[PDB]
Design a protein around this ligand. Structure first.
Ligand SMILES: CO[C@@H](C)c1c(Nc2ccc([C@H](N(C)C(=O)C3CCS(=O)(=O)CC3)C(F)(F)F)cc2)cnc2cc(Cl)nn12
Ligand SMILES: CO[C@@H](C)c1c(Nc2ccc([C@H](N(C)C(=O)C3CCS(=O)(=O)CC3)C(F)(F)F)cc2)cnc2cc(Cl)nn12
Lengths: 354, 363
């Protein structure tokens, strides 16, 4: 029975390009793929909208996890560039027109992967135009629907079959669909000489330094701040919540859980976020998570709160410090009272790394 | 439902006799055996040994013109190869030492031309020594180290030994090749001697065993049949009669599309004649036939080990390789040295023969 020493996955979805058309599918697809891989016991890091420097750092750190026998999976969705026989992943800060030096060369990553003694290394490119390496290269021409590749991949990914056979079925499913024939293509390259599957069990978990390094890094990237009850001088109590949508996207939500009898009406809101997050106050404190651009973790969030989506957590170099304001009017009075409390929740999710 | 092929054509090239590089042995057996397995799957096959740059570019370009809509193509190359700047190359027998890209055939350039075809299935197999529905098998093996114990020259190469055991399966070509890759992985002898990468954009259930689409007489179909029929035309057997009464039969067999075996035998000898030798000579200079290799008592003495079994026995054999170099009619002389009963004098006679342009030279 083939076994994995560990299962690690890096998933990058680029959508909000500074000088190129915006994509919608990577958001839904990276989130879908993250939960499918968690079902197969992968430790996953999922990141949205990365610059060149961020993507190069993420890919280099992912490659350091590929110790002998480890199963790796690198998925990229976004703009892709093809030039002089090479393909390139396009970061969100790419100039117009594309230049090689600003993008990540796919063949350079494949060359770095061939140097590893991984039990399985899957590299999937879902682009808009022995190492045991399986490379899938999906290409399509330029609301919450999946992209073509993920629509077919998600319905086969949990199969207990050799990864090459399973990807071959995905390519055949696409060729049997009229939507794909003149819109989407799939190319698979493989030097897999053994029976290896994403479903293969992880080997009897020892506590070696090598395995502890891999678990530590992943554990940091998943650290959410604990829920907080803020107590104000006037008696008002605000509950503060934190949810992870991606490794670099966190949803914050607030609710006035206790309002004293003597206070007619009160409003709470979050403000003064670190400037490196670039939070537009007009997109914060929404009555629904969907209004923040958060449509995936929405269902699993408490109701009747105010929501703020904190994306770009990878850009935070300091502690996440922000303010909770309170505007309350006393009974039988004509004054609006303001009071604020600073909150330091440390370095959440991917910002926990350094 | 059952996928169909409009037609099935294959071009197999095996380079062994390098001018400035080491000689290989496995392409001879591998190209011969793969030809016979493909014929069993109803492919029209062209098999060529030892091609120069010019010959290879012509063979590949002419095979690419056969790839009409719905056609199943297979290109197989065995010989020296090299990878330079992400591109791989097929080395022709006239390539200088060291390799120069302009003298070699770029594999990526060929794959690009295949992409422009509406083929039902396009299979490109490289067995090198170091929409289109394309399936590309890139096999690379370690060049034989100087002190390694060599085995028989009639042994299969590593890739073909594994491929021949799966090739006839009625299974999707990508799955079949994936099983070949896995068979090589289980064999620990191949761990550092043979590698195999499979690249595929096949989007349908295509197999080499798919039946050919209800055989027609269209112009486009007849064009592929005609070119292939020309490359398989052998001269018919001849009976040469000499003044002395002796009759000599001259026979012809094909080993490869560019290798023909000629054989002579005495079919009638008058009782008054005792000694009687027939031998072939005056071959076109372009073929470069060494007379020391001609007129042998066994096919194996000419370097012919594959069609030997199907050749008539008790003949004199001559192997004519490099038929692709023949630029005019294959004209040669059949000599007769004989002796009458009771006489010490050896009498001589000869007859010139024109057998047209055989096999690949018929193009
Ligand atoms: C080994 O670590 C774990 C968590 C890890 C990865 N590491 C990783 C991911 C993203 C980044 C980038 N970061 C923070 C910067 O580039 C920073 C560098 C320091 S800085 O001050 O410039 C802030 C930006 C990005 F993409 F988020 F931006 C860097 C490292 C990658 N894949 C996996 C898969 C699994 Cl499982 N674990 N894993
Ligand atoms: C469409 O035709 C058929 C027979 C055909 C091919 N054609 C083909 C064409 C040229 C050559 C070369 N030739 C003669 C020259 O290069 C000559 C060029 C003119 S010349 O006078 O210089 C002598 C050499 C070589 F390789 F033999 F050398 C070899 C093969 C190729 N693949 C297939 C597969 C199937 Cl099925 N049919 N098929």
């Amino acid at each position: 029975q083939p076994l994995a020493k560990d299962k690690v996955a890096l998933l990058i979805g680029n959508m909000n390009y500074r000088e190129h058309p915006k994509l919608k599918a990577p958001l839904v697809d990276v989130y879908e793929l993250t939960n499918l891989l968690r079902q197969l016991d992968f430790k996953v890091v999922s990141l949205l909208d990365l610059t060149e420097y961020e993507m190069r750092n993420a890919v280099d750190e992912f490659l350091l996890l590929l110790d002998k026998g480890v199963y790796g999976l690198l998925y990229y969705a976004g703009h892709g560039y093809e030039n002089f026989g090479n393909s390139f992943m396009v970061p969100v800060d790419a100039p117009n027109p594309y230049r090689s030096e600003n993008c990540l060369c796919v063949q350079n990553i494949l060359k770095l992967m061939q140097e590893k003694e991984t039990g399985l290394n899957v590299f999937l490119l879902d682009m808009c135009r022995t190492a045991n390496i399986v490379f899938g290269y999906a290409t399509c021409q330029g609301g919450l629907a999946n992209g073509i590749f993920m629509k077919f991949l998600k319905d086969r990914l949990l199969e207990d079959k050799k990864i090459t056979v399973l990807l071959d079925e995905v390519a055949e499913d696409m060729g049997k669909c009229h939507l794909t024939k003149g819109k989407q293509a799939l190319e698979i390259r493989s030097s897999l000489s053994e029976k290896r599957a994403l479903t293969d069990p992880i080997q009897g978990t020892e506590y070696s330094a090598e395995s502890l390094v891999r678990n530590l890094q992943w554990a940091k990237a998943h650290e959410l701040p604990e829920s907080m009850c803020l107590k104000f001088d006037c008696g008002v109590q605000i509950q503060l919540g934190f949810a992870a949508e991606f490794s670099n996207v966190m949803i914050i939500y607030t609710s006035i859980v206790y309002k004293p009898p003597e206070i007619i009406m009160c409003d709470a809101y979050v403000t003064d976020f670190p400037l490196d997050l670039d939070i537009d106050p007009k997109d914060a404190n929404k009555g629904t998570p969907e209004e923040t651009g958060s449509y995936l973790v929405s269902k699993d969030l408490p109701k009747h709160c105010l929501y703020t989506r904190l994306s770009s957590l990878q850009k935070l170099k300091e502690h996440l410090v922000f303010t909770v304001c309170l505007s309350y009017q006393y009974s039988g009075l004509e004054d609006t009272v303001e009071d604020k409390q600073e909150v330091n929740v440390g370095k959440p999710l991917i910002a926990k790394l350094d």
